[PDB]
Structure 1
């Protein structure tokens, strides 16, 4: 019951109250100084006055393409163990098994020996994926 109900050993760490005497933590308590740190927190960015690393280092080159359609990546080894009987592989089926993000286009990698002779109804297969699928005896789609 509740009177036998206990917290887990090692959890429920007591709050270290700070400004409660010298035996508990101290009068200055961490801020054992008289400078800025004693009275206020200096921004983590500020180095001292010299140019911080944020301006000292050069700007990361390049840009970012707005029209970049990122594809989700499906492990053919995961196909091998997930559907050892083959038969048919749908995207709805793969997400039903939780192997890939929902509502997204996919790609197939070839890292893993494929033995399951199964056609895959999906998108954008790699050349090595075609090598493994045709090795098993299946067919690529898009």
Structure 2
């Protein structure tokens, strides 16, 4: 920068730290589930992977965005509260 203290040196470091053991989930929304499975029925992680809504060899978490009308007994890890409520309202089951 010509000799004055550069932008990347006059500014402070971003605070905090990074978690070495953080667990990451591949997420999917109930709206997506409803769009992919209009007929309902039991739905699993491998079915999600096959339909291409989620990555393979990854933990799957279901989120509660969108609307759901089909009755689906989905199985995943670590559901969200809203997604669980929507599943049980539509009449399916949300099991880990």
TM-score range, shorter chain: over 0.9
Q: TM-score, normalised by structure 2?
A: 0.96
Structure 1 segments of 4+ aligned residues over 2 angstroms from their partners: none
Q: State the Cα distance separating 1:108 from its structure 2 match.
A: 0.9
Matches of 1:113 and 1:97, distance apart in 2: 19
Q: How many residues align?
A: 96
Q: CA RMSD in A?
A: 0.7
TM score, norm. by length of structure 1: 0.66
* Alpha-carbon separation, structure 1, partners of 2:83 and 2:67: 10
The structure number with the bigger radius of gyration is 1
Tell me which of the two structures has the higher relative contact order, counting C-alpha pairs closer than 8 angstroms and 6 or more residues apart: 2
**CA distance in structure 2 between the aligned counterparts of 1:80 and 1:140, rounded to whole angstroms:** 14
Q: Which has the higher helix share?
A: 2
Cα shift at 1:73:
0.7
1:46-78 per-position Cα deviation (integer Å, ceiling 9, x unaligned):
x11100011111000001000001001112111
Q: Which has the higher strand share?
A: 2
User: 1: CA distance between counterparts of 2:75 and 2:16?
Assistant: 36
Unaligned runs of 5+ in 2: none
Matched, 1:48 2:22: no
Distance 1:120 1:49 in 2: 61
The C-alpha deviation readout for 1:107-142, integer Å capped at 9, x for no partner, is 111111111111101111001011100110111111
